[PDB]
């Protein structure tokens, strides 16, 4: 059925908050990666080689 203006506007508000949470968590993942790679680069940088050779 056709959504009212307010129903569409609620969906937009909900999506705005979800976008904010997703952006937050992207930066948490990117920060984890960066902190981990500092340790890798300093201890065992061969892990970062492309292609990988164990």
């Amino acid at each position: 059925r056709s959504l009212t203006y307010e129903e569409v506007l609620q969906e937009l508000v909900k999506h705005k908050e979800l976008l904010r949470r997703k952006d937050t968590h992207i930066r948490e993942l990117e920060d984890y990666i960066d902190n981990l790679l500092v340790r890798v680069m300093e201890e065992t940088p061969s892990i970062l080689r492309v292609p990988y050779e164990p």
């Binding site: 990666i33 960066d34 902190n35 790679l37 500092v38 680069m41 940088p45 970062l48 080689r49 492309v50």
Partner: protein, 167 residues
């Protein structure tokens, strides 16, 4: 001789495809922004010396990252790449040069690279403006295409030669 070389410049300009072109002779029309940090190697004979290039790559993100110091640490060479089809990528080149010199060691050999020369129809950076900026800042300069190959070997090999001349 093992020379650490870093690739710097805006997201999208072609760093990862310049790496794969030079080190594996491969190119991907699809590549997405790079996650984390990686490196690939290629070894050339310079005169009678075997020289390994160990060339590092990460996304061209302007924001602060934890990996920045270790990325530049010990690098003796850099290719600072812009897209000659995208003037924003060139305008911002003095900012990357700023970062390089803040983290880079004093003797680093730097080449300014205008990538995507195969898209001459969509050009937004005259060779001349870019050459002069390079000449003014003591940087090497070339235009390349990771796609068709033009100048890619020459770009990385010229850096390695200049490093080799110093060492």
């Amino acid at each position: 001789f093992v020379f650490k070389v870093v690739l710097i410049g805006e997201s999208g300009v072609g760093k990862t495809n310049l790496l794969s072109r030079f080190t594996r002779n491969e190119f991907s029309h699809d590549s997405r922004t790079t996650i984390g940090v990686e490196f690939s190697t290629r070894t050339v004979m310079l005169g009678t010396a075997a020289v390994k290039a160990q060339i590092w790559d990460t996304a061209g993100l302007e924001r602060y990252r934890a990996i920045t110091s270790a990325y530049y640490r010990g690098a003796v060479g850099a290719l600072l790449v812009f897209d000659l089809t995208k003037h924003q990528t060139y305008a911002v080149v003095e900012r990357w040069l700023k970062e390089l010199y803040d983290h880079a060691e004093a003797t680093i050999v730097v080449m300014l690279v205008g990538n995507k020369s195969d898209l001459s129809q969509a050009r937004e950076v005259p060779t001349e403006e870019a050459r002069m900026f390079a000449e003014n800042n003591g940087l090497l300069f070339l235009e390349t295409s990771a796609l068709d190959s033009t100048n890619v070997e020459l770009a990385f090999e010229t850096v390695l030669k200049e490093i080799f001349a110093k060492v």
